[PDB]
Design a protein around this ligand. Sequence first.
Ligand SMILES: [Mn+2]
Ligand SMILES: [Sr+2]
Ligand SMILES: [Sr+2]
Ligand SMILES: [Sr+2]
Ligand SMILES: [Sr+2]
Length: 174
Amino acid sequence: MEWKDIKGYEGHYQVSNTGEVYSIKSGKTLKHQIPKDGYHRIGLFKGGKGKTFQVHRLVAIHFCEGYEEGLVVDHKDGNKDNNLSTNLRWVTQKINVENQMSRGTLNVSKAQQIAKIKNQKPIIVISPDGIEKEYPSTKCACEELGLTRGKVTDVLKGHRIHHKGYTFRYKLNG
DNA sequence: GTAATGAGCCTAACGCTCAGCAATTCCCACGTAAGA
DNA sequence: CTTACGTGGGAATTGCTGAGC
DNA sequence: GTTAGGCTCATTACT
Ligand SMILES: [Mn+2]
Ligand SMILES: [Sr+2]
Ligand SMILES: [Sr+2]
Ligand SMILES: [Sr+2]
Ligand SMILES: [Sr+2]
């Protein structure tokens, strides 16, 4: 098990390729914090003030060739508890995602399902006769009243004053 | 003693790349009324 | 006849969203 | 994936 001195904290702490962070003045080795996001963190103190660090970055920074600005540390096996240096590697955020893609575990349908709902802006229609009705979306209205979306939108933005006799205005507050 | 520190624990944010769908932008086509 | 103006389509863009990193 | 800051309690220190 290889040990190296934590750069910028030499003489105070040390790190091992297995993911162990040892303190010299404290005598013992810092216990890993494992939050809800599941990444092991620890706090390193320097001159009274202590900062929070990610165990896997510390390992990667000290035992992994490939570090370049903006790069991100990846856990090859997806096991965030496996922090051996051999399981980590400096990768490009694009590449880290492409891997999820390959494994087919990147989820975007959940966002889409919630966007189809959340992108709707309630509008108010005004008939030539004066009667008004509030619809859930410009789309919904156009369909019910046989209108064209491009048009209805133009009126809503003030680019056109009316369309097919009706006029439109957004429903504010809600 | 009292007080500055260090180890543990947590919460809060924010960026990457994704790809379906509502909202938008706006170039076009037509019929009609106005211009030279 | 040659422009303008008033409509009404609809094709190509934007922007939003929550997940697993 | 990434960083910051907060809180508690013990450890040490010593105003
Ligand atoms: Mn990964
Ligand atoms: Sr909405
Ligand atoms: Sr919205
Ligand atoms: Sr365009
Ligand atoms: Sr004439």
